[PDB]
Specification:
Chain lengths: 286, 286, 293, 283
């Protein structure tokens, strides 16, 4: 059976390294501290949970994180005002808008996201940062935090990515599409699948590397997995318990390496956000 | 044998149609013309040819196209003076920098391209337009002209794209990477290959749709082709004669539809540029 | 448990020291004489710039005059052919090579260019003449490609006789894999050659008492495949993206597992790489000595 | 075990070549393919083989001249004849029958490598060998015995790519070019020779097996892999091959008899290359 990729343990190493890094910055530049802001619209329970998890990690590391929660009935004009203020506040080094917005009024998510200054866009969701990533200009952009965490998990196997066939199932702005770009510029041959893909099972079977981000619980069957594959399950699905987008039991029999759910991608996503935040803070000093 | 996709004929139809739009807009808004500018650094032979073809097309349609040719000794800051000037000239509706820059100095191509105002970026090469396309926001952006042209050639076959498996060989900023995005958001399942892909022949054979943009003369062999494939060949190679990146003679015995070289993608690239220029002229009027 | 390391960095240094002393003696025995190598480059590929510079530095340390001729990517075939003719006829140039691949805007027939090199100056062993002599076992009338030369020296460093053993070569390229097969064969190994159309590569690899890998596919050859006790020679130099560095160099062999199965193994970097350069200097010195005779 | 009948197969190649030579003569009147065979000494085996080749050329319509130099020929005298055959625009291909039988010490390598590669229809020059051994198969002459062996293997209809082939013998004229030829048809190839340990086990790996050792019936049928394609190049004097034919026939799926197997194919491939050098000259 597969080696388990323990996201809980790996993310802990990353947070301790960031913690010590932040401590050293404070020693070298007294009074300085990385500052994150999280903006939310509405009151979705899962958004509440994930934001709380992010605040706890910021606090462990010594990043000052402020959470601003606007009600369901806010207007796009109201959110734009807050984004402008965060852009202009020079003590805020990065900030993000937790998605999806949960609003009674139609609010243009792409307009809201794209008002974020690219230098503070630690979620890497602006068009500017996406376009840098999608075209291989990887050193001047924030990369979205879940693809970053997935990449670090793949690298924990010690198997080089270059030349491997990687399959990404899902193409969302937040996970699937940036994952494809990250694997491409790590020199994998990449196939991207979606809801219009036919013969998904045969596409999945091509992947030496498989990243699944669909939101469909255990829809990717273990019998489809290429023997020896590295399997990265981004799913967090609540069912009659938490399960991933991959059928874990059968997949684990065939994979060389696999992420458990929970304790896999989830903690790595949060740790990567903290890493990007520390990076913007260091960039701000210089 | 495959039906020939005749880009030379298809483009003529597009250009004749564009001329009618331009004539119609000239009488509906008197004294108004679409205005294009093409900036060149250095004196490459192929760049000279391609710029000349674009000027020819713009002349036939009624677009006022200017060609600024800077010497090989141009600095990055001299280039930025022209880009800044073109952004600010309200009479210029779109402009592009022919690539690659041929300068004996070192010029950050990315810094130059990304100084172009996005609403004049008729080549779709800025990060902003690339990020929109790469995230599926296809109604807000300029799409690179060679991908635009390849999509039109594919539609001319009448075979729907949704659910087919598309293989793109090459990932360049100008062609291969935007070709992947355009096919993906037309709901193909897409594999991208490059110089590090292993078993390229096996990977090419999965493509119901095959777009080759490698700059390697006749490198993709006909034996590799999936029987019945739609074969789109972007290569323009001068060999001991002009050949594409696909071995055309034997690929024709396998494809259901194939683009010749010359007379395939090339003229479509130019027509699609004139289309985007007219689109930004109409956009400017509102 | 772990395999002994074939330290190409140390071994190549012993070779260059030896060549240094014997070029210092040649410059005394025949005053005013300097062994001279030319490197012809078309284009400006970044990896080619590094390997050329690494070769020039080795030449300079030993006392070889090495001339880098870099033609722009606009160069035509007939223009390259004029340079090669010029180096063929320049009697102060004892060896020269064309760094491959050529990086030109124009298509240049690489075989035409390479085979125009005079075989007695073909210190890279790339002409069809030198390849034909090697491939038919006529080893003392030819220049052997530098990477296979370095690999053979690394193999002999083990102290393990080659005759009788089963050798597996993964890769059949003109520069490395095919001349490697010939060199092992005429050293009396039984030799199996693998490539991209080999089925059960893992089983074929498992046959190799001697294993030479030259595929350019990073760590594709799994350690689990390695025959226990094998001598493992890794020719791979693969630059894999690495945002913690911005890349790193890895071999064609998964070293961390392979070294628990092999008796001897080359690390990457520091293995075949420096030996390749040391062998070029050795062949260059040999061609200068042959010029005097 | 099916029988690869070189005598029948070669007859078809010679008939195909014959008509091909007839059509060529009708298209360019007064033009015929011309071969020259040079011999040093008077070995009986070479007299026989050269005669068999001359006869094949006559059946097809190739004009072949045989020049036989004495045992006391010098290297210099042989070189004069090669220079003349190179410079004779009438001659499209020529070969030197090997081994040279000379009282004097003559460098065979030197003699062979003075042949112009465009006329080297035996493929024995270092130039043609280096093209073949590096996979540039499109512009060289492949030695005739390996050419014929490959034709025999293809006659089975079993594809070569991905099969494991074993070659026993590494000689300049058969074994070494035979390895190259199978390799660039994408077999995985093992070469064995007189220093190969456990030759029995090695031979057992071959889906394709070519034996070119000159050791009468040394390869035992018990060694053959069941279903193997067995190609026997041996001509050992009764005449028998290098494979124990009776036992090997109970294991192989296809097998060459000796005589009537490779032997006829070798001669037909030389004629094929001669006709081919005549076409290249016509342009
Ligand atoms: N920290 C973390 O672990 C983390 C972070 C973010 C998200 N996630 C999780 O990842 C999962 C997906 O998230 P998302 O943001 O990517 O959501 P999303 O916007 O709903 O995207 C779903 C994607 O999956 C595709 N898909 C749906 N059904 C499919 C099917 N039957 N076959 C193939 N593709 C199919 C959709 O295809 P179309 O494009 O054709 O609709 C779409 O591209 C969820 O469980 C989410 O919580 C986890
Ligand atoms: N109107 C038109 O028809 C039109 C318009 C624009 C361009 N083009 C043509 O499209 C072609 C593009 O090539 P270029 O060199 O000019 O651009 P380039 O920017 O050098 O891109 C070459 C792409 O092909 C890949 N590639 C190179 N060798 C390969 C191989 N052996 N196997 C697989 N992939 C390989 C490269 O991979 P890496 O990324 O790994 O290096 C890269 O992604 C040219 O012929 C160009 O003229 C045509
Ligand atoms: N000093 C040194 O260390 C040194 C010097 C020179 C070169 N090199 C290195 O040697 C490596 C290869 O270079 P090269 O010129 O030999 O490369 P190449 O021309 O790209 O050839 C690679 C060979 O490997 C084979 N191959 C590819 N994938 C395979 C697979 N999955 N299974 C089996 N065989 C496979 C190919 O098979 P096909 O033949 O069927 O295509 C081909 O023969 C590179 O890392 C290069 O930098 C190192
Ligand atoms: N027209 C035809 O059909 C035709 C044409 C030419 C030749 N032939 C025949 O083919 C046979 C071989 O000819 P050749 O020119 O190749 O002869 P050769 O030059 O004597 O070569 C014999 C090869 O077999 C190897 N060998 C000898 N004993 C061996 C053993 N016990 N185990 C393994 N390998 C062994 C030798 O190995 P070493 O290299 O280690 O000595 C050598 O490589 C002869 O019978 C010859 O007449 C037939
Ligand atoms: N702007 C914006 N909008 C978004 N929707 C996202 N997505 C997002 O935050 N996802 C997300 C983040 C963290 C977890 C998580 O915490 N998982 C752990 C359990 C707790 C632990 O970490 O200890 C586990 O599974 O083990 C799970 C998820 Cl789905 C974003 O990133 N940016
Ligand atoms: N900024 C920027 N930089 C770039 N380098 C490009 N690329 C580009 O212009 N390519 C390009 C454009 C046209 C042709 C062509 O005209 N081909 C015709 C022959 C003439 C005809 O009849 O039209 C044919 O093949 O038949 C061929 C090519 Cl390669 C770009 O688009 N933007
Ligand atoms: N004509 C022609 N064309 C070619 N492309 C080649 N190949 C070639 O030069 N390869 C090559 C050479 C040297 C290195 C290297 O620097 N290796 C060392 C580090 C420093 C050291 O050399 O000491 C290490 O890995 O530790 C790496 C490589 Cl890939 C050729 O030989 N002839
Ligand atoms: N330059 C050079 N030198 C060389 N020594 C060779 N070798 C060579 O000719 N060998 C050779 C050739 C033909 C036969 C033969 O006659 N075989 C048939 C019988 C009748 C028929 O040929 O049809 C059979 O056995 O059935 C047998 C052999 Cl050993 C060469 O090729 N080139």
């Amino acid at each position: 059976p597969a080696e388990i990729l323990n996201g809980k343990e790996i993310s802990a190493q990353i947070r301790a390294r960031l913690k010590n890094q932040v401590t050293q910055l404070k020693e070298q530049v007294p009074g300085f501290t990385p500052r994150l802001a999280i903006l939310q619209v509405g009151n979705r329970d899962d958004s509440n949970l994930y934001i709380n998890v992010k605040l706890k990690a910021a606090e462990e590391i010594g990043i000052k994180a402020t959470h601003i929660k606007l009600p369901r009935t806010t207007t796009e004009s109201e959110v734009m005002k807050y984004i402008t203020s965060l852009n202009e506040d020079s003590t805020v080094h990065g900030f993000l808008v937790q998605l999806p917005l949960d609003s009674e009024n139609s609010i243009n998510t792409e307009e809201v996201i794209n008002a974020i200054a690219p230098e503070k866009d630690v979620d890497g969701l602006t068009s500017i940062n996406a376009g840098r990533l999608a075209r291989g200009d990887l050193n001047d952009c924030f990369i979205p935090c879940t693809p970053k965490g997935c990449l670090e998990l793949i690298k924990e196997t010690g198997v080089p990515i270059a030349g491997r066939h990687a399959v990404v199932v899902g193409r969302s702005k937040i996970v699937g599409a940036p994952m494809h770009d990250l694997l491409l510029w790590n020199n994998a041959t990449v196939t991207t699948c979606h809801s219009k893909t036919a013969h998904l099972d045969e596409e999945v079977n091509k992947g030496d590397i498989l990243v699944v981000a669909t939101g469909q619980p255990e829809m990717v069957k273990g019998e489809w997995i290429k023997p020896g594959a590295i399997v990265i399950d981004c799913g967090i699905n609540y069912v009659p318990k938490v399960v991933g987008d991959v059928a874990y039991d059968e997949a684990k029999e065939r994979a060389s390496f696999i992420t458990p759910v929970p304790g896999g991608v989830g903690p790595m996503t949060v740790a990567m956000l903290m890493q990007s935040t520390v990076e913007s803070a260091k960039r701000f000093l210089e």
